[PDB]
Amino acid sequence: AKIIWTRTDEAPLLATYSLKPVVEAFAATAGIEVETRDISLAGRILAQFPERLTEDQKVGNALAELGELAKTPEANIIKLPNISASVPQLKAAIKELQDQGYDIPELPDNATTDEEKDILARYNAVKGSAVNPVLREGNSDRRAPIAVKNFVKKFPHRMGEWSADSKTNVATMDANDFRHNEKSIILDAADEVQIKHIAADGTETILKDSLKLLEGEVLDGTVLSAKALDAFLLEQVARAKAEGILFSAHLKATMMKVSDPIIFGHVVRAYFADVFAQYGEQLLAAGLNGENGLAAILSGLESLDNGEEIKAAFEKGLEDGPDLAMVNSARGITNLHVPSDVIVDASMPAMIRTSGHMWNKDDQEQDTLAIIPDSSYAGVYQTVIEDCRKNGAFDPTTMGTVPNVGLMAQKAEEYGSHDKTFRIEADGVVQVVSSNGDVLIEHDVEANDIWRACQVKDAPIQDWVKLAVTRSRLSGMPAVFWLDPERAHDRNLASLVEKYLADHDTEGLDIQILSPVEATQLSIDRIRRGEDTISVTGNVLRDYNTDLFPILELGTSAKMLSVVPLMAGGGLFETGAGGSAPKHVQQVQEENHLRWDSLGEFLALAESFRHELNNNGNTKAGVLADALDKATEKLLNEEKSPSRKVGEIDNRGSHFWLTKFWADELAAQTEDADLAATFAPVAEALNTGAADIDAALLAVQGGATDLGGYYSPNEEKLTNIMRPVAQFNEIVDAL
Template sequence: MADPTIIYTHTDEAPALATHSFLPIIQAYAKTAGVEVETRDISLAGRILSQFPEFLTEGQRVGDALAELGALALRPEANIIKLPNISASVPQLKAAVAELQAQGYALPDYPEDPQSDTDRDIRARYDKVKGSAVNPVLREGNSDRRAPASVKNYAKAHPHRMGAWTADSKTAVATMGVNDFRANEKSVVIEADDTLRIELAGTDGTTTVLLESLPVIAGEVIDGTFLDVAALRAFLAEQIARAKAEGVLFSVHLKATMMKVSDPIIFGHVVRAFFPKTFETFGADLDAAGLSPNDGLGAILAGLAELPNGAEIKASFDAELADGPELAMVNSDKGITNLHVPSDVIVDASMPAMIRTSGHMWGPDGQEADTLAVIPDSSYAGVYQVVIDDCKAHGAYDPATMGTVPNVGLMAQKAEEYGSHDKTFEVPADGTVRVVNAAGDVLIEHAVKAGDIWRACQTKDVPIRDWVKLAVTRARATGDPAVFWLDPSRAHDRNLIAKVEAYLPDPAVVGGDTDGLDIRILSPEEATKLSVERIREGLNTISVTGNVLRDYNTDLFPILELGTSAKMLSVVPLINGGGLFETGAGGSAPKHVQQLVEENYLRWDSLGEFLALAVSLEHLAQTTHNPRAQVLADTLDRATGSFLDHDRSPGRKLGTIDNRGSHFYLALYWAQELAAQSEDAELAAAFGPLAEALAAKEETIVAELIAVQGSPADIGGYYQPDVAKASAVMRPSATLNETLATLG
């Protein structure tokens, strides 16, 4: 790797397609400052291929780019721009494998029920790729996520549409509150370096080791908890009956991607609960055919044609669907329900979108309707209920006047990665799950029954110290209140509160005193109430949260404030001095790809990439003492402001500029800013002719970009597009390509 170098990650879906268009611009401009921009493939397809070299030909093998970047993130020279990637559910993983096999890669099938050591090894390798496999590796720092001033000002000047709310809305959140992960949580702080073991002491006298070795260090917080599945089933049956009685849509909101072990299982229980008669009658047939409710209703229905009694089972599903409450829909035109695919309805994106749309989701009739939003675990469900109650009482928020809620998130060194690790288990038998130290002492234990879901997480002390410091840093920089969203009635949070209260007054931790700063500790519900009260007054409140709430809050508030979370600035100051710069959420990426393939029109908005690139260049300028890179950063900031002022984001319909056109305009405004700046005469001279040429050829370039719209586009694959085909599709303006090539 050359130095100085920026690593621009190649990921998935719409962000990956946009990269084919934007990266050549980045590389051409950065080169003028002596900065190399290299790519690393951390896409789902790339991650899969890296795990199975012995199944591939020499020419097909790829390195483990994720592991390489994980090592780089520990070094002070790290400068990584991370685009959204697929956090793969099992159906997505299987689809990617099938596509790669069709492209000539002799990958093994995903073993549903591994019986041999070979199958178990293959399953373990695939499991490394599932869920939130990327983020824990790269996030060697805590999260600083906020709306840049230019983006916030644009949202105020051009407010997005918000659905109206009424006091008589029936929309509500339903959550367990008892016998769930929150209620059953236990937490300990490790006194000295140790190695823990997680085991199940069965009621039959046997002991099963669930995890042989869990290394821990002094000061680390270790949690264990479980979800009582019998209580879950009873709760789900009650909510299905409630939705029907109240005449509202039934929906479930989970995170089957990041919570890759627990939430697909919970999703499967929801599917079973909605179709109890079908599973009672035909459950054995479905099990024998490998049709699991954990994979969603869509996968089951697709597999029924192979069963001799498939038509009978389909009729049973249809009858119960008609008899139950109306289901919220992912796509009512295509009959895709909330229960079709576990990764279709992700809580952190789906709940804010529902709140923004009058508390409505789409029903089977294609119309919006009030909704019962079922979030089984009560850990953070109350946050959404507070916002819903506020909207019922005071109406929708006004993006033209509302304040902002930036986030400082605890996530470094895999902090609080619930469900994204090897410490979540579907309990195989009745007994007691125990966390035991090397001396044999039991630190945490829970009496469980077969089928319960038990999980643990760990949070090291160094990330907690860094998190507290980052919160204080942001409070100093802004003058806004910083609120730690921690609940003293919850075991894990009590341990964090003790650490926060110890570190806040320590100048060595927070870099000085905290005099004059407004720093508070409130439960998530109380913190939400404070934040939305201040939002309505046009005031800002920094939310300082753990990892899961970081995920939720950095969608909830941006979607309400800006209409999307893709426009947030996401900086991860790495603990060892490097920088990770994230470009926003990718939740709508699949729909964008579908539209590109059908109409050669990509609506993906690359504003997040523009914002991340600017802070990446600024970080590089500071760490490598490269003033020319600072000029690039400053001019890119100004160009992004012009981009917003002139409303050059992708339009909503054919005949307007799409993602490719937005890249052209960013390149134009950036070149103009570089040509006009006075800090570096040589750079100004280099970009003057380019700025003039791009401006002179604007009409031709835009016409060439729009001309391709309206016809299908062949990119050669969804999970692994063909590079040449995708590049041709994403760079259709010969005039733009030739003009960029003149730089330098």
Template sequence: MAKIIYTHTDEAPLLATYSLLPIVSAYAAQAGVDVETRDISLAGRIIAQFPERLTPAQAQADALAELGELATRPEANIIKLPNISASVPQLKAAIAELQEQGYDLPDYPESAETDEDREIRARYDRVKGSAVNPVLREGNSDRRAPASVKAYARKHPHSMGDWSADSKTRVATMGQDDFRSNEQSVVIPADDTLRIEHVAADGTVTVLKDSLTVLEGEIVDGTFLSVASLQAFLTDALAAAKAEGVLFSVHLKATMMKVSDPIIFGHVVRAYFKPVFDTYGDQLAAAGLSPNDGLGGILDGLGELDNGAEIQAAFEAALAEGPRLAMVNSDKGITNLHVPSDVIVDASMPAMIRIGGHMWGPDGEEADTLAVIPDSSYAGVYQTVIDDCKANGAYDPATMGSVPNVGLMAKAAEEYGSHDKTFEAPADGVIRVVNAAGEAVVEHEVRTGDIWRACQTKDASVRDWVKLAVNRARATGVPAIFWLDEDRAHDANIIAKVRTYLQDHDTTGLTIEIMDPAAATAYSVERIRRGEDTISVTGNVLRDYNTDLFPILEVGTSAKMLSIVPLMNGGGLFETGAGGSAPKHVQQLVQENYLRWDSLGEFFAIAASFDHLAEVEGNARAKVLGETLDRATGTFLEQDRSPGRRLGTIDNRGSHFYLALYWAQELAGQSDDAELAAAFAPLAEALVKNEDAVVAELLAVQGTPADIGGYFRPDETKVSAVMRPSATFNEALASL
């Protein structure tokens, strides 16, 4: 039987799965397709790390490792929903919830002093940050707005804030002594084994990472950010925000960059509250209250200290004295500095640009903002868009073009910070990458506390990326621009490979160029304003940024993107958009039984999964399912069946009902398979007949709290009951 693997992930996408998956499974079964699930949620990944501590009923297999192996095989067909890319505070919260549910899990060790603590921390470190994506992405990324979504956005343009030519909003970035400027890069001449080591000023050698296997032609990079320069930069940025009367905000990636960016975030918290840390820093550290975890965690822990009220008053005084902070939730007093994973650059910067260069201030009003992006690698992308909006006004979703993306990410390409190759320098000295012959191939002089990191990009990944870019350019007739900066060490090596591998393809009549990121941005937004499309061909981190930036401006959200990963060995990975996992949506469901999550990205991924299955296995019915689902999704958009934003309108569950209705109608009316049409005709008739009853049952549950039995690991029985409250719909679906 043909098989699709549907992943259980986290938060809103997980809750939506309990409503959508029964529909998909029932429809797929009619085509001889079995839909299986695998739990790769944060909670599931934690549980899989400690089998020896759990009962047989509690233990579960390492589904992520299983899917990682499957992704290397040609039969792979995986639908991957958004995960929590866990910061340390989220990881701790998930552990605490599982402990309350009876799981015998150890606490996360803040400092690993013993061998046991080091082992525990190593296990937890395997699941935090962007731990899932590098394992599954055995191919490069093809992400774009489906034609139906783009057409809908043009017909029903979303709101855009007004831009003023005299807006004070701008990006502040280091430009020197940062990751971009300190980068070194080398192409490995032959298969080798590397190690990363720190050599202290007194000659003491500490191995930071041993037995790092690399292949011929692989690119290995190392770089560091000077903490002294960071601190000086932050001091200047805080003074500038105060003098200019704008909000201060910092924009990092404390999820993908799970080691480096939380440390940087901690330095920002220290810089803003310098008087507090000068006076109470040692006491806070002794109490385990780290600025790396954010202001919120420190404030929550002050109640345990004898002089907690005194320290809280000092924080409040610093807030009153410093520049106004941008807010995550001004009503609840949650600032930009409360939680490192609350303000993620790839989502927060596009949202700011979309509303006219504003963020929300402590008074609940919008205001111009100094957006602090310490590392200068891609800060220029956002500054270029801001400059364009100041000069030309807001973009018009009704007429603007599109910027699809081809992203280099296969085999963990360029996953800076998502792995075990990022370190805080333990002392003054040198951090270097040494080959098996004992030769240093990358070497940096560092000071105590400097943040050093390395990454790898395999040659085969680059070759496949170039092929995908050429194929997309040929399929669309749209210019493909490689966003690469010849003045950056890593990009210079990538450029050499791109120029070599482009020669393997017939590019006659195609526009394929290489531009640095700021120039590529300017080129793309100029075309956007003319209604023209431009393919951005980027590295992995910039892929993450661009697949939020442009979709949020074009179609209002990145969750509605078609995201296909053609796996290098012939399988398919179908991701459901870049919309995050929406914790606020979970909170709303628990408070008032209303789930705002839009599953449109899932609809596109499911259709593409069926199409892939039809192509590789010759399953004609899978092809019918994919084609009819595409048409049903078009009707879904035209009829505006996405979830509303307030009680009394259909939410995620109602949107799933309407998709099921339109899909059943398409299947009943198609002419390619009479037997399949006959199977769905009664269901289509029943859903149309009972539409009012189903909608009434779905609306009736709104407005009261919902018990799902857990945030990170909900109770399956409870959450299924919450997400499938219409007996009429459930009975009709069961009849299929």
């Protein structure tokens, strides 16, 4: 079997030249090969223009090849952070590659010829998040790392004290929202449906022409009532003002790129009701409706004859209305300025951790009325708020853990509803018509309403249920499926879950189904008494829960174990969710100190070995994993992660110490005498030379360093820079 270690960009790329050689050496003792595959921005660019490269220049298509491997049982991929190219990065890499002799074309700013359109199309295939779509062939398994969990028990982050008088509460809709208006069905045969809009004029309008559906696929139809929404919003504005608490709105404008910016607009107009009551007609016509935030509005006023007048009306609105949660008080930026500034899954946990407070214009903590329009998930947060007001803040040193098994395969549910979300312009009805004419789903709609369709396939669902059983079985932690009895969609999934659980051996397992609210209560009841509960949820709750609990338990959701059980039985282990940190590379170029933290790679590697143990019966891989777990605990116990300052331990130094501790554990363990015998001399060697190696790894730091490039650094220079201590390299190479 072989593990594929992704060769990426910037910081993690540098770290890879130091860590991968060690991983390969250690993995080999369990009969595991470790190979790199190039998915760097530079490599993916070259992959698009093979016809422009000489035979020796061609790189093939590593990403495409990994996509294929991911569909086979042999897949064991460790995925490190990489660049999701912006136009500037793309342009910069193009130039560097050209300077290196790769005769690739310029990035067309505006395609004005057939050649440019073609070139642009190929470059667009490389821009942005091009990697994840290809590698994530499955559902999500995310857990708080126990090595991290154990550290936090020793050094707990700060949790804001909670008062039983807290006035903080989530405000959400009682009806007429996505949750209550949702209708869901399960196709019993493949079908190519269509979404129509029939007005009162009977005038039927086609919203979505062709939608291919598979047998067993779950399809939902729902609508958000603009009328009920505005009524709700105005009520909350008044309540926040009446109670003297901060008004805040928590949406996900970035991911839900269609529905949420629109809902954000309603929030803005609701807050500045008087302004739009006086200049509505004008403002909306000018496109200044708040869907781009208050900032977009204000800047657009300097384009109107009465801009200064309207601008004063807004300023009056801010002084008269309830105080707003602040994004940046120093710049007067409120919750309402930019739609994407406040993102629900990030903002709610922070507020809960901070005694249920957000910040006012005077940079002071204050209770808040947290508006979450749709009620599908608002109850989860509300349940935690009431619990904290009742029992106090959670205690990181004794609290249990709540992992997540999430349904996300093939843009499952809401995260794939973007091309099926429409802003209703006229009263009437929207219907999903079968290929034969039958009306599968139909909703009464009114101008300004938001109609949405979601879909999730059967295989993803069966795999999700299997993953839940697997995690409960392997961890011994009870699993709870979070399904809302009030949602047609969830009611459909509940029956499928009940059906598919029967395909598994669940004797001895504690598995059940509860509404998101009941599930949250049980989970936090147990967490407070130091017990654990796996949350098995849909896509959105997966996105919320993997932020919520890790932040409460660890103070951050940044250090997580992230696994994607691949379709064909293989595994994808993501080391981190951030970027490839360009500033870290800059520091290496400036003073040869890499502060990139490889903790995520250590964690993912241990799980990768366990994949081999549990799925390919590699017992030696489990021994390697157990020793690596202990080595990581010690690295953290001695605070040997990279320091941010030159002259102090950096990425290379952390690798050495992890390696030393790992060899020690392997030489000390008694499960495999052979492995013990193989590592005894390695540990011995690393130990006598530790003092010299550690000093040498501090000595190399200090001055300017030349990587021979940036997006396409020079192979020989990188190796020389990242593996500078011969004493260490020789111990590793000998293995």
